[PDB]
C-alpha cells in the first residue's frame, strides 16, 4: 500500500504539487498511524537508501516532502496515540522483532526509530554521496521544529553526536537538536558546535 | 633466413587450433617424457581481502610519518574522512616563535595540489605586523615553488619562512 | 606573434630559480600584492594598446589556455588577482572572460581546486554589467554542470558546491540584477515542463 | 657588473657547470680596510643569460656569522665554496628525477 503510494508520489516534478500531495498524504495515513508508520520507517526509507538503484528517485525535490513526511509520521507516532478501532483492534495481533541489532525502553516504534537513525548516520558516511547527502540534509533541516520531542539521542556510544558534528560541515541547527537535557554528554557536542 | 616455416605456421590463426597436439606431443614424448613438471602442491587463490579502510593510498602517510619531530601533524573534524582524508593541522615546535597552523587540503596522489587555503587567513593575520610579514614571506616563497608538492615542500617552505621571520 | 607574447608573459610571471639548497634569506622580497601585479597589469595594458583590440577574443582564449596549462592553485589564484585588477582597470570586460573561461577548460570534477577557483572568479565577476544578452553564459554554465555524474563522491562536496553558490547569487539578485523571464527560459535545456 | 674582481671554480660537483666570481666592496666609507667582501653567485655555463639574483644570503651572510652560539673571519668564505660542493649536485639529480615521478627535492632529514 505505502510502497505503491510513494511510487505514484514522485511524478509531480514541481514543489507545490509535491507539497499538496504530502499534505493530503499525511492525513490519508490516519486511522492506521501506528502500523503504517512502523512499516514505513522500517522499509520505505531503507528501500531507497540501502541501494543505488532507488537512489535515482531520492534526488527529486519531492525528496524534501518525503523527509517532511518521515519526520511528521515519526512525531505523530512517538506522541501519545491510542488508536482503538473495531476493524483494527480485531486485527492487531501479529509477531515482529525487527531484528534490530544494537551494535529508554523496548518498544517497536522506538526501536524502529533507533534503527532508522542509525542508518541515517551510516548513510551520512563518506566515500559516496550523490543523492542521499541532500536527503539527510533535508531530513535534519525539517527535523528542526519547536514544541517537538523526538530525536531523544541516547548518549552511551551512539552516533547522533558524531552525526551532528559531520552535519555541521553542511550553523546552530544541530546545536539545538543535540541539546537533549543539558546533560554533561551535551557538553561535547556544544564544544564541537562552538567551532 | 629459414623463414619458409614461419608463414605456413602462422597460417593456423583461427579458432580450430587443436591439431598442433597431434603434430608435436608424440615426438616430444620421444625426447621429453617428464611426468614431474609441477607435482608440488599448487592451487590458485585470486584474492582474500583488499581495501585500505583507513585512509588514502598509504604512500602519503608513510612519507609524512618520516618527517622531523619539529612538526606536529593532526586532523580536523573529518569532512573528507574517506576519499579526501587530507586536511592537516600542524604545530611548529622548535627554537622559533609559534604561529597559526595551515590548512593543507590535498588532491589525489598525482599531487597537482597547492594544499593550504588559509581558512583563517583574514582575522588571524590582521593581528600583528610580525606575523603579517611572516605570511607575506610565506606566500612570496610559495609563489616561487614550481609545481609544489604538498607532501614535503609545503611544510618545509613554511618552516623556512617562519625561520626567515627573524629578519 | 602570439607565442612571443605568451613567452613574454611567462618571463614576467614565471620566475623559476635554483633549488635554494643553500639557505639564503635576503634574496627575494617583492611586494606581490601591489608591485608585481601592477607591473603585470601595466605590461598587459601596453600590449593591449599595441594592437588587436577587437580581435582579442582568440587572444584571451590563448591567455586562459596558458593559465590553465599550469598545475599550481596558488599560481592560478595569483593570476586571477591580476585579471580582477584588469577588470577594475577596465580591460577584459566581464562578458568576454566569462564566455571564454566557461569552455575548453572546465575539467568537470577533474581538478577540484581549479574548478573551485574558477567559480570563485565567476562569483567575483558576477557583477558583470551586461545587457539582456547575458542569458547565454547562464545556459552554458548550467549545461557544463549537467555533465556532472550522479554519484561522483562524498568528500569533495563543498568545493564543487561553488557552482551552486554562483547560481544562487545570480537567481537571487535576479530580483534586482537581471530579468526573471530570461532566467526561466534559460532552463529550457533542463526544464522541458518538468523532467527531474 | 663591478670592478677588478676574482673568481673560483670547482671540480667535485662537475667540470664547469657554474663558476663563482666574487669581489670585495672596495673603497669602504671612511675605512682604509674592511672592504666587507661582497659576494655574488652566477649560473652561466653555452653561457646562459638567466637570472642570478645572488640567490643565497648575499649579503646578509655576515649576520649568519652572528647566528652562532659562541683571529681570522675566513670561516665564512669556505662555507660558500663548501656548500656548493654538496648543493649543486643534488638539484641536478632532480632534473633526472623530473621525468619518472615525484621530484620532491630539497628535503632535509631531521637537520
From Swiss-Prot, chain A:
It is found in: Nucleus. A motif (LXXLL motif 5) lies at residues 45-49. Expressed in the adrenal gland, brain, epididymis, heart, kidney, liver, ovary, pancreas, prostate, skeletal muscle, small intestine, spleen, stomach, testis and thymus. Belongs to the Mediator complex subunit 24 family. Component of the Mediator complex, a coactivator involved in the regulated transcription of nearly all RNA polymerase II-dependent genes. Mediator functions as a bridge to convey information from gene-specific regulatory proteins to the basal RNA polymerase II transcription machinery. Mediator is recruited to promoters by direct interactions with regulatory proteins and serves as a scaffold for the assembly of a functional preinitiation complex with RNA polymerase II and the general transcription factors. Required for basal and activator-dependent transcription. This is Mediator of RNA polymerase II transcription subunit 24. The lineage of its organism: Eukaryota, Metazoa, Chordata, Craniata, Vertebrata. The gene is Med24.
Swiss-Prot record, chain B:
It is found in: Cytoplasm; Nucleus. One of its GO terms (biological process) is RNA polymerase II preinitiation complex assembly. Keywords: Activator, Cytoplasm, Methylation, Nucleus, Phosphoprotein, Transcription, Transcription regulation, Ubl conjugation. The keyword Transport does not apply. One of its GO terms (cellular component) is nucleus. The keyword Plastid does not apply. Ubiquitinated by TRIM11, leading to proteasomal degradation. GO terms for molecular function: transcription coregulator activity. Component of the Mediator complex, which is composed of MED1, MED4, MED6, MED7, MED8, MED9, MED10, MED11, MED12, MED13, MED13L, MED14, MED15, MED16, MED17, MED18, MED19, MED20, MED21, MED22, MED23, MED24, MED25, MED26, MED27, MED29, MED30, MED31, CCNC, CDK8 and CDC2L6/CDK11. The MED12, MED13, CCNC and CDK8 subunits form a distinct module termed the CDK8 module. Mediator containing the CDK8 module is less active than Mediator lacking this module in supporting transcriptional activation. Belongs to the Mediator complex subunit 15 family. This is Mediator of RNA polymerase II transcription subunit 15. It comes from Mus musculus (Mouse). The gene is Med15.
Curated annotation (Swiss-Prot), chain C:
It is found in: Nucleus. It comes from the Eukaryota. Component of the Mediator complex, a coactivator involved in the regulated transcription of nearly all RNA polymerase II-dependent genes. Mediator functions as a bridge to convey information from gene-specific regulatory proteins to the basal RNA polymerase II transcription machinery. Mediator is recruited to promoters by direct interactions with regulatory proteins and serves as a scaffold for the assembly of a functional pre-initiation complex with RNA polymerase II and the general transcription factors. Belongs to the Mediator complex subunit 23 family. Component of the Mediator complex, which is composed of MED1, MED4, MED6, MED7, MED8, MED9, MED10, MED11, MED12, MED13, MED13L, MED14, MED15, MED16, MED17, MED18, MED19, MED20, MED21, MED22, MED23, MED24, MED25, MED26, MED27, MED29, MED30, MED31, CCNC, CDK8 and CDC2L6/CDK11. The MED12, MED13, CCNC and CDK8 subunits form a distinct module termed the CDK8 module. Mediator containing the CDK8 module is less active than Mediator lacking this module in supporting transcriptional activation. This is Mediator of RNA polymerase II transcription subunit 23. It comes from Mus musculus. The chain holds residues 1 to 196 of 1367 of the full protein.
UniProtKB/Swiss-Prot annotation, chain D:
It is found in: Nucleus. Belongs to the Mediator complex subunit 14 family. Component of the Mediator complex, which is composed of MED1, MED4, MED6, MED7, MED8, MED9, MED10, MED11, MED12, MED13, MED13L, MED14, MED15, MED16, MED17, MED18, MED19, MED20, MED21, MED22, MED23, MED24, MED25, MED26, MED27, MED29, MED30, MED31, CCNC, CDK8 and CDC2L6/CDK11. The MED12, MED13, CCNC and CDK8 subunits form a distinct module termed the CDK8 module. Mediator containing the CDK8 module is less active than Mediator lacking this module in supporting transcriptional activation. Component of the Mediator complex, a coactivator involved in the regulated transcription of nearly all RNA polymerase II-dependent genes. Mediator functions as a bridge to convey information from gene-specific regulatory proteins to the basal RNA polymerase II transcription machinery. Mediator is recruited to promoters by direct interactions with regulatory proteins and serves as a scaffold for the assembly of a functional preinitiation complex with RNA polymerase II and the general transcription factors. This is Mediator of RNA polymerase II transcription subunit 14. It comes from Mus musculus (Mouse).
